[PDB]
Amino acid sequence: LSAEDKAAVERSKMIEKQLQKDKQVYRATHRLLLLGADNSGKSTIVKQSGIFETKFQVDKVNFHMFDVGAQRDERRKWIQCFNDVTAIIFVVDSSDYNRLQEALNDFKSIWNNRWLRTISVILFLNKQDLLAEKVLAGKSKIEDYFPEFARYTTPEDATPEPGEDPRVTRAKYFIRDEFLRISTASGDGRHYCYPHFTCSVDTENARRIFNDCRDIIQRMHLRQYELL
Amino acid sequence: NTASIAQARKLVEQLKMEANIDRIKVSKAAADLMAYCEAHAKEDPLLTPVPASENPFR
Amino acid sequence: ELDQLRQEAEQLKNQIRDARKACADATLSQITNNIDPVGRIQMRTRRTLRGHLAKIYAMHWGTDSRLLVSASQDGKLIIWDSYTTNKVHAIPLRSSWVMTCAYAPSGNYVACGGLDNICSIYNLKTREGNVRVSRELAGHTGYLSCCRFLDDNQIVTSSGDTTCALWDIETGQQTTTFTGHTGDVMSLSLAPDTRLFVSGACDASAKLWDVREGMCRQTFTGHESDINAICFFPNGNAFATGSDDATCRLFDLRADQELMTYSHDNIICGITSVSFSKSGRLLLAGYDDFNCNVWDALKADRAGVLAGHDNRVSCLGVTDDGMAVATGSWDSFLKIWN
Amino acid sequence: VVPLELARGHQVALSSISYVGCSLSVLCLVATLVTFAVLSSVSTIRNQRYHIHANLSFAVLVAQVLLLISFRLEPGTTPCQVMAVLLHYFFLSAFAWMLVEGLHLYSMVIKVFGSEDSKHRYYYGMGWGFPLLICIISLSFAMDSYGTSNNCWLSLASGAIWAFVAPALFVIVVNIGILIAVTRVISQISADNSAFKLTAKAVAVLLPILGTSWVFGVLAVNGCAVVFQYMFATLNSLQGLFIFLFHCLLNSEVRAAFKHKTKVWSLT
Ligand SMILES: C[C@]12CCC(=O)C[C@@H]1CC[C@@H]1[C@@H]2CC[C@]2(C)[C@@H](O)CC[C@@H]12
């Protein structure tokens, strides 16, 4: 090192200092994948020309939301760079009784991939209001859509909202069970499925994401510690 | 529609012009490749190891 | 009608294949056998470039064979010296994820692209000030994959809109769009001559493209998998492709047919990157089996291995002077072999 | 306090068992140390926890070797009193190291948010300064009470044992609390589904490397020390074998790293 190439050394040292400073922010930021489709509650959840981003503060822990607006039919192309994500958010309509089997097919497709078979999936439910006036109205009966309604009993582990007729909770647990049936087949590794039931205009969402991510991180760390 | 018809016509013209491409035996191309590999073999410090003298990475 | 067009566009492909069979008289594994094999190669790395924040995806080498680029998921562009293992400039950018690196031949313009559908070019040598944006470029509804500079005023690129397009720095307007591909294009390389360039897509096909007229010159054959990377021979008459089929292929531009099948029974992992050297005897190709691999070109014989990376590789390149080989891998590590 | 260590009927099968256990522990621990030294380039063994394991194993190994040498040394001779303080310092360093490991486990389990903080300086400081402070405060006043007539260890009938039993009790109480909390968490997790299998595995895994087996010493020193010394010796001297076996042959990440390194070595 002659007496010319020493300013570059201190410049590089400063660059490493800036990178180490950035580390303290990058390592403490949690990022999520927010999937979904149209006619869902994307506008409501996102309100709290390529890749979009929204920032929100929850319990003094930074969180990152990622949603795309230029995704074609193909999905496996850019999914390669999604392996480092922590949890995956899935949004379903659950109000219109049609456009539901496609959601299950999408759930199976994401749940059965090979590269990302280490990320858990966070379920969600939207448009709780629209479901209410549809079940009590004898126009769009769910029996004609799914013919297994005649064979269904409300599970014992139930937390019904007060003032709800048995049909409403029956339909809610119908959706929950039909969403959980696919998940219990595969998996058995480091990822599970976490059904959730939250309204659209509500603030308890952050608590739900907090508890889900805390449980996932705790399970992952305990598994890494050989205890399980 | 008209856009699909135009795209089909463009691809048909492309395929028609694909036939009017000069063709020569791959043996001649292989000969040129071998000649280039053999002639440009001394001036490459990968296949032939170089002494540490004329090596800035040493 | 569409059925009539589909029926009519069969015999011409049939006679193209017949001409391919007629022209194919011999193969490299049948005429190149008297040459001396390269033998064992003990390439041991001396410098290990660390400091990247997260997994990297691309790299390039400058004209001076001194400055190299690399980008990561964190959204930083850094240019190093590769001699005193030091960095000259760190370039943050708006798009938090990037997918492309490129260095201009004059060593002034660096192009960064990703899935943001915006092409950003940075003027490293400013008149008075630090690094600043030069001219944003957009117009593609798909995700950009890769781009390589051709001159200082124009640049070609590949996007997620199953089509290719070139842009002029002045007026920033797309002149002639390159259309004809069905699958998503995810690989593109240039040629020493500024007249022709090739690209590969997920349709297991490649097409030769012309810069000036924007008309597809030649079409390649099947690859049985999605093409990820492509490289061009220095002579300008051959190119090598890669895919997830674990079979690298070397198709000559003049021949436009499959000649070499880099098939090994042990390997099952796909190929990530491919780059040649000046001599053309050797060829290094990154692998998804958690390490790098070399491959002789004229001979289908293994010539040692290049292992040492914790994670799978993502990029690989060879300097212009053909002295060092640098490989990038997902473990946030940059390794350069002398 | 009356020692009541070995009067008659328990003197035999004590020193020989100690020798056998120490030999097994030293072999296993030197194997663990050489394995850690070899397996340091890859990313799997790059976290803070493995550094804690390495330094803890080194401290235990050096303390055990020093004790083995201390067994064969004449009393009333200067090197004996020179190395007694080293013996005590090394044992206290091991105690503080498993205390730090327990604190790290507590911060990792119940406080998952903030585990990755790069606290290397604080861990080393609190692991290698507390024994030094205890040693200097002991040598400030306790000098004559550092060599007895029986063996090279310090006298236990002068009140100078304060530097060991109190830290032992503190570490044991903290360990009991942490283990109870972790066992409750594990039982809650496992209640959502083999009932008494994962809990037993966790207890056995956390027993030797963290140090919850020192409770028997209190009973051994005072109160019906007839049958509770065989278990003390067997479960304390053979700490090496236990830690080596468990956290070097059952750790999932260690095996994968070793296989990868073997593949790399065989490639060239
Ligand atoms: C308490 C001592 C001596 C004091 C000390 O530093 C700890 C050490 C622990 C092992 C003990 C040893 C005293 C002699 C004992 C009790 C032998 O009987 C077998 C184990 C030995």
Residue contact C305–D43, C-beta within 8 A: no
Q: How many Cβ atoms are within 10 Å of A161's Cβ, its own excluded?
A: 10
Assess whether the C-beta atom of D5 lies below 6 angstroms from ligand 1. Answer: yes
Ligand 1 midpoint to CA D217 (Å): 10
Q: Which of D110, D252, D189, D116 is nearest to A192 (CA)?
A: D189
CB neighbours of residue C331 within 10 Å? 21
Q: What are the φ/ψ torsions at residue C248 (nearest 5 degrees)?
A: -70, 145
Tokens representing A109? Answer: 């497709």
CATH of the domain at D228: 1.20.1070.10
- DSSP codes, D145-171: TT--SSSSSPPSSSSTTHHHHHHHHHH
Breaks (C-N over 2.5 A) in chain C follow: none
Instruction: Looking at the structure, give the CATH architecture of the domain made up of residues C4-337.
Output: 7 Propeller (2.130)
Domain encompassing residue A152 = 29-224
- Is residue D250 within 8 angstroms of chain A, CB to CB? yes
How far are the Cα atoms of C186, C210, C256 from residue C163, in angstroms, in the given order?
10, 14, 21
Helix (H/G/I), strand (E/B), else coil: C6 = helix
CA distance C148 to C156: 6
Q: How many angstroms separate the Cα of D173 from the Cα of each of C167, C237, D52, D206, D211?
A: 71, 77, 21, 15, 11
Task: Collect all residues of chain D within an 8 Å Cβ-Cβ radius of residue A227.
Answer: 182, 186, 198, 201-202, 205-206
Of residues D123, D158, D133, D130, the one with CA closest to residue D143: D158
CB contact under 8 A, B44 and C252: no
Which residue is associated with the tokens 């990320």? A119
Taking CA atoms, A173 is separated from A108, A147, A153, in Å, by: 19, 16, 9
- Specify if A58 maps to a domain: yes
Q: Is residue A17 part of a domain?
A: no
- The minimum CA-CA distance between B14 and chain C, rounded to whole Å, is 7
Comparing CB atoms, the residue among A8, A15, A50 nearest residue C90 is A15
Task: List, as residue ranges, the binding site of D.
Answer: 11, 236
CA–centroid distance for A87 within its chain: 6
Closest residue in chain C to residue A19, using alpha carbons only: C53
D with B: 3 or more CB pairs under 8 Å? no
d(CA D245, ligand 1 centre) in Å: 24
Residue A208, domain CATH:
3.40.50.300
CB distance A50 to A78 below 8 Å: no
Three-class SS of chain A? CCCCCCHHHHHHHHHHHHHHHHHHHHCCCEEEEECCCCCCCHHHHHCCCCEEEEEEEECCEEEEEEEECCCCCCCCCHHHHHCCCCEEECCCCCCCCCCCHHHHHHHHHHHCCCCCCCCEEECCCCCHHHHHHHHCCCCCCHHHHCCCCCCCCCCCCCCCCCCCCHHHHHHHHHHHHHHHHHHCCCCCCCCCEECCCCCCCCCCHHHHHHHHHHHHHHHHHHHHCCCC
Strand order in the sheet with C185-189: C185-189, C196-201, C206-210
Q: Do A225 and D250 touch (CB under 8 A)?
A: no
Kindly state whether residue A20 falls inside one of the protein's structural domains.
no
With a 6 A CB cut-off, is D53 part of the ligand 1 pocket?
no
Q: CA nearest D197 in A: which residue?
A: A228
- Contact partners of B by the rule of 3+ C-beta pairs under 8 A? C
* Backbone CA torsion sign across C175, C180, C184, C188: negative
D219 in contact with A, Cβ within 8 Å: no
Query: Is C191 in contact with C184 (CB distance < 8 Å)?
Result: no
Q: Is residue A193, in this structure, part of any structural domain at all?
A: yes
Q: Residue C62's CB: how many other CB atoms inside 10 A?
A: 19
C-beta pairs of A141-144 under 8 Å, 24+ apart in sequence? A142/A97, A142/A171, A142/A174
> What is the domain extent for residue D223?
15-267
Residue that the structure tokens 């999605």 belong to: C226
Does residue A21 belong to any structural domain of this protein? no
Report the nearest atom of ligand 1 relative to the CA of D237.
Answer: 20
Structural domain contains residue D5? no
Let me know if C221 is exposed, middle or buried by CB neighbors in 10 A (0-12, 13-18, 19+).
Answer: middle
Q: Identify the residue whose C-alpha is closest to ligand 1 atom 8.
A: D153
The protein residue with its alpha carbon nearest to ligand 1, atom 18, reads: D5
Q: Strand, coil or helix: what is D94?
A: helix
Give me ligand 1 centre to Cα D137, in Å: 22
Domain count, chain B: 1
Q: Closest CB to A16: pick one of C51, C97, C117.
A: C51
Longest dimension (CA), chain C: 66
Q: Please state, in angstroms and rounded to a whole number, the distance separating the CA atoms of residues D103 and C155.
A: 57
The CA D233 to ligand 1 mean position distance, Å, reads 10
D54 to chain A nearest CA, in Å? 16
Phi, psi dihedral angles at C156 (to 5 degrees):
-95, 160
Q: Rounded CA gap, C10 and C17, in Å?
A: 11
Q: Which two tokens stand for residue D94?
A: 């091991």
Domain total in chain D: 1
CA distance C109 to C10: 46
DSSP character string of D42-91: SSSTTSHHHHHHHHHHHHHHHHHHHHHHHHSS-SSSHHHHHHHHHHHHHH
Two structure tokens written together for D4: 């009541």
Q: Evaluate whether residue A188 is within a structural domain.
A: yes
Structure tokens at A147: 């013919």
* Number of other CB atoms surrounding residue C98 within 10 Å: 24
Helix axes D78-109, D162-190, angle to 10 degrees: 20
Q: How many Å apart are CA D251 and CA D268, to the nearest integer?
A: 27
What amino acid is encoded at C268 in this protein? I
- CA C326, chain centre distance (Å): 14
Pocket-testing residue among D148, D153, D214, ligand 1, by greatest number of atoms within 8 A of Cβ: D153
B24: containing domain? 5-57
Annotated binding residues of D for 17beta-hydroxy-5alpha-androstan-3-one: 11, 236
Residues 6+ away with beta carbon under 8 Å from C229: C187, C241, C242, C271, C272, C273, C274
Q: Is C88 near chain A, with CB under 8 Å? A: yes
Q: Please name the residue that has the structure tokens 């207890």.
A: D203
Residue bearing tokens 């339909």: A171
The closest CB to that of A78, out of C86, C90, C115, belongs to C115
Which two three-digit tokens encode residue D3? 């020692």
Query: Number of residue pairs across B and C with CB atoms under 8 Å?
Result: 99
Residue D215 lies in a domain: yes
Provide, as residue numbers in chain B, all residues whose Cβ is less than 8 Å from the Cβ of C237: 29, 32-33
Q: Do D43 and C307 touch (CB under 8 A)?
A: no
**Count of structural domains within chain A:** 1
CATH of the domain at B29: 4.10.260.10
Do the domain assignments include residue A19? no
Q: Which chains touch C (3 or more CB pairs under 8 A)?
A: A, B, D
Contacts of D42 in chain C (CB under 8 A): 310
So where are chain C's domains? 4-337
Interface residue D203 vs chain A (CB under 8 A): no
**C307/D268 Cβ within 8 A:** yes
CA of D154 from ligand 1 middle (Å) equals 10
Instruction: Give the Cα separation of A89 and A124 in Å (integer).
Output: 7
Which residues are registered as beta bridge partners of C252? C238
For D136-164, give one letter per residue: b (16+ CB within 10 A) or e: eebeeebeebbbbeeebbbbbeeebbebb
- Determine the straight-line distance between the first and last CA of chain D, rounded to whole angstroms: 63
Radius of gyration of chain D, Cα coordinates, nearest whole angstrom:
20
Instruction: Please state, as a whole number, how many other Cβ atoms lie within 10 Å of the Cβ of residue C88.
Output: 14
